[PDB]
Amino acid sequence: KHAIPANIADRCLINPEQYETKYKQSINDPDTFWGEQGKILDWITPYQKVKNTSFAPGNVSIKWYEDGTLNLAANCLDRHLQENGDRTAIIWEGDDTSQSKHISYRELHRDVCRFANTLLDLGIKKGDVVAIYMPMVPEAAVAMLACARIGAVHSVIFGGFSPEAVAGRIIDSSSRLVITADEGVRAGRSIPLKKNVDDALKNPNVTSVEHVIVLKRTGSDIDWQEGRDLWWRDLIEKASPEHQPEAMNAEDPLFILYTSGSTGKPKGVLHTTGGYLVYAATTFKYVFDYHPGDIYWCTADVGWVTGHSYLLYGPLACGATTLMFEGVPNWPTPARMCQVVDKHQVNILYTAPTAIRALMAEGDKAIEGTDRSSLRILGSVGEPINPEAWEWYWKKIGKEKCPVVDTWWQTETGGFMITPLPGAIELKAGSATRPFFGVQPALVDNEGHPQEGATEGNLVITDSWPGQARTLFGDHERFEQTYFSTFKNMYFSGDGARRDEDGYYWITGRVDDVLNVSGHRLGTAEIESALVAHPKIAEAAVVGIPHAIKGQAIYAYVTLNHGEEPSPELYAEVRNWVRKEIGPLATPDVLHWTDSLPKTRSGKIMRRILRKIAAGDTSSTLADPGVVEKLLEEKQA
Numbered sequence: 001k002h003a004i005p006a007n008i009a010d011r012c013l014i015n016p017e018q019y020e021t022k023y024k025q026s027i028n029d030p031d032t033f034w035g036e037q038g039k040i041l042d043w044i045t046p047y048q049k050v051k052n053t054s055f056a057p058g059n060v061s062i063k064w065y066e067d068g069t070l071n072l073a074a075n076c077l078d079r080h081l082q083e084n085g086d087r088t089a090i091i092w093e094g095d096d097t098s099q100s101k102h103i104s105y106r107e108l109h110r111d112v113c114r115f116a117n118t119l120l121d122l123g124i125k126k127g128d129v130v131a132i133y134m135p136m137v138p139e140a141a142v143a144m145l146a147c148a149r150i151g152a153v154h155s156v157i158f159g160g161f162s163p164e165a166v167a168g169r170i171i172d173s174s175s176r177l178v179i180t181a182d183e184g185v186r187a188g189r190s191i192p193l194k195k196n197v198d199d200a201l202k203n204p205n206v207t208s209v210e211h212v213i214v215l216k217r218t219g220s221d222i223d224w225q226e227g228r229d230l231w232w233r234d235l236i237e238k239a240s241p242e243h244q245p246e247a248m249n250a251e252d253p254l255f256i257l258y259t260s261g262s263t264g265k266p267k268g269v270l271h272t273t274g275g276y277l278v279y280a281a282t283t284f285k286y287v288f289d290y291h292p293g294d295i296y297w298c299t300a301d302v303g304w305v306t307g308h309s310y311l312l313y314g315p316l317a318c319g320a321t322t323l324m325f326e327g328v329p330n331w332p333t334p335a336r337m338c339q340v341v342d343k344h345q346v347n348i349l350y351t352a353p354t355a356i357r358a359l360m361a362e363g364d365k366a367i368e369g370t371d372r373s374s375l376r377i378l379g380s381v382g383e384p385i386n387p388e389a390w391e392w393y394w395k396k397i398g399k400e401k402c403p404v405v406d407t408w409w410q411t412e413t414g415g416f417m418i419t420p421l422p423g424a425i426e427l428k429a430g431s432a433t434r435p436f437f438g439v440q441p442a443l444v445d446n447e448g449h450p451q452e453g454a455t456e457g458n459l460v461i462t463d464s465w466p467g468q469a470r471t472l473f474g475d476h477e478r479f480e481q482t483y484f485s486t487f488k489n490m491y492f493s494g495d496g497a498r499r500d501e502d503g504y505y506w507i508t509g510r511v512d513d514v515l516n517v518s519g520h521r522l523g524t525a526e527i528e529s530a531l532v533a534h535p536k537i538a539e540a541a542v543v544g545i546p547h548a549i550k551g552q553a554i555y556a557y558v559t560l561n562h563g564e565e566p567s568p569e570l571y572a573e574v575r576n577w578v579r580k581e582i583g584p585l586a587t588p589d590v591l592h593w594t595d596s597l598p599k600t601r602s603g604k605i606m607r608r609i610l611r612k613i614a615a616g617d618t619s620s621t622l623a624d625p626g627v628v629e630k631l632l633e634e635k636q637a
């Protein structure tokens with residue numbers, strides 16, 4: 001247990017008693033609690049209904065603030081203009097540190113308005129899906145906000161996805177438009193964004209895209225399709241900076257984020273507007289102990305939910321200054337992240353255990369020549385962090401001075417679910433601690449039996465909360481089954497957790513067939529499909545193994561078609577194939593050639609034995625037992 005330091009106790013918005021009181025009321029009386037708390041936002045017509053939800057088998061229905069209207073872009077921009085139009089909305093720090101920007105709330109609003117008009121003239125309407133495939137530049141934020149302003153439904157696709165991965169997301173969403181850049185810049189290198197868009201758009205199944213809008217970021221020689229492709233600058237220049245925001249209904253679709261699951265290819269997790277935004281703003285405020293003037297930096301990419309809720313929307317709803325870094329925390333040197341912290345006097349740092357671990361491998365080289373005094377609060381997100389990395393982060397980055405908020409949540413939860421509050425809750429290294437306001441966690445065994453006291457089990461949430469995802473795009477039925485059918489009447493996270501005697505949660509990772517690689521969520525089944533689509537592969541089974549930096553790496557067991565033969569050229573080819581099917585994020589670290597997949601009566605494949613072997617272990621009965629011996633020997637090279 002870490003004590004709350006006196007400087008936080010002196011300023012904190014939520015103290016221990018406040019946490020207890022607000023939490024109790026959020027459970028007992030959600031309508032009063034969230035009816036009051038919803039006023040963190042401006043509404044165009046005020047809501048009357050607040051909580052109206054059900055996890056009931058075959059009638060899953062989540063509505064928050066339903067009869068109220070609002071606009072997300074006016075809450076994140078317009079309403080800040082009168083008094084704080086000159087406050088920096090976004091600090092942009094380039095890969096190359098000589099390149100930066102302060103974009104005032106005024107400047108940002110003006111651009112969102114011009115870009116809203118641009119989208120509107122191109123024929124984009126409320127409800128249309130817009131695919132955003134952009135590097136970490138401020139224009140990505142401009143694009144996302146402008147979509148929300150006019151009520152279109154943006155789908156941000158992470159820059160590191162391959163053409164094949166982009167196209168799938170375009171097809172499932174029926175995106176009418178792609179917004180991208182000529183190239184992204186990361187670690188001194190160019191990322192071929194627009195070319196990737198070119199290749200994705202040649203897939204014969206893509207039929208919905210009418211235009212691609214291209215940001216001239218590096219000025220690279222790119223292929224151009226006349227009529228389809230439009231320069232960002234040409235368009236926005238011609239567009240009026242005047243735009244009135246129209247009322248959106250609280251339950252109007254805000255965005256889609258494609259997410260990996262246990263089965264199938266990734267599905268489009270859908271968020272609406274009112275509930276999502278209240279929850280984002282609220283969690284941001286209280287968990288980062290945000291005070292006006294605090295310089296806030298979340299390192300996560302715009303392409304992930306953390307990038308949606310804690311890079312842009314939450315921060316901006318609260319009128320914060322938020323920092324968007326173009327590059328990587330360790331380029332040119334491991335000291336970079338902290339150079340960034342010093343250069344912009346960052347007070348809140350929210351980052352990833354993978355990054356932390358990579359910085360930790362380099363020890364003091366991660367802090368040499370840097371000061372870090374400006375920091376008051378740290379956060380960790382996206383995967384479990386073990387005590388030792390938590391301790392090193394607390395100590396070297398926070399100089400033993402900063403509460404670390406380890407925030408547990410998911411794309412499907414919209415915002416933080418189980419998390420410390422810096423002035424309310426004493427910290428245990430590696431523990432996400434206590435549920436947030438509105439959040440009712442429980443642990444169950446594999447049969448759904450609730451586990452009481454200090455115990456472990458399958459982590460579920462037993463009631464709704466304002467930021468909850470509302471559906472899977474085009475597939476509400478799959479939403480019911482993926483999340484509300486294992487444990488009837490309950491939200492099943494896919495995670496396992498331990499609860500200790502204080503009621504602190506310790507998230508131990510996914511209990512379904514989902515991997516966490518560098519803090520990226522990936523389905524084993526989707527990697528196997530990508531392997532089997534190779535004309536030389538017959539079958540594959542993919543597991544996670546522990547990895548010092550990355551958390552888990554991908555260890556693929558691969559059965560070649562009859563006749564074929566392993567070579568070192570084949571190893572690289574198959575890695576490059578997975579990379580083109582999905583992307584670098586999903587490249588297997590190890591290929592284990594085998595004719596010895598362990599199967600049952602029916603072809604069902606034995607995953608537990610495959611896991612342990614890959615971990616490098618030696619300690620049930622299948623359909624042919626002598627393959628466990630073969631699979632061990634094979635593992636010794």
Ligand SMILES: CC(C)(COP(=O)(O)OP(=O)(O)OC[C@H]1O[C@@H](n2cnc3c(N)ncnc32)[C@H](O)[C@@H]1OP(=O)(O)O)[C@@H](O)C(=O)NCCC(=O)NCCS
Nearest residue numbers: 159160191300304305306328352354355358382518519584
């Ligand atoms: C530690 C970290 C900075 C290291 O990234 P890295 O050094 O670039 O290596 P990664 O494992 O991330 O990725 C490897 C490859 O993907 C590429 N890649 C990663 N992010 C990319 C992006 N934003 N755009 C294009 N390519 C990208 C890298 O350039 C590299 O390319 P290469 O294989 O051709 O050499 C990073 O992976 C990380 O901290 N991720 C955490 C995720 C997170 O914040 N989770 C919360 C979101 S919900």
Ligand SMILES: *OP(=O)(O)OC[C@H]1O[C@@H](n2cnc3c(N)ncnc32)[C@H](O)[C@@H]1O
Nearest residue numbers: 382383384406407408409410411507521
């Ligand atoms: O891609 P995604 O955001 O939906 O992934 C969410 C999953 O990632 C893991 N996760 C996220 N945050 C944490 C923390 N703070 N501790 C442990 N694991 C974490 C989970 O597996 C979650 O389901």
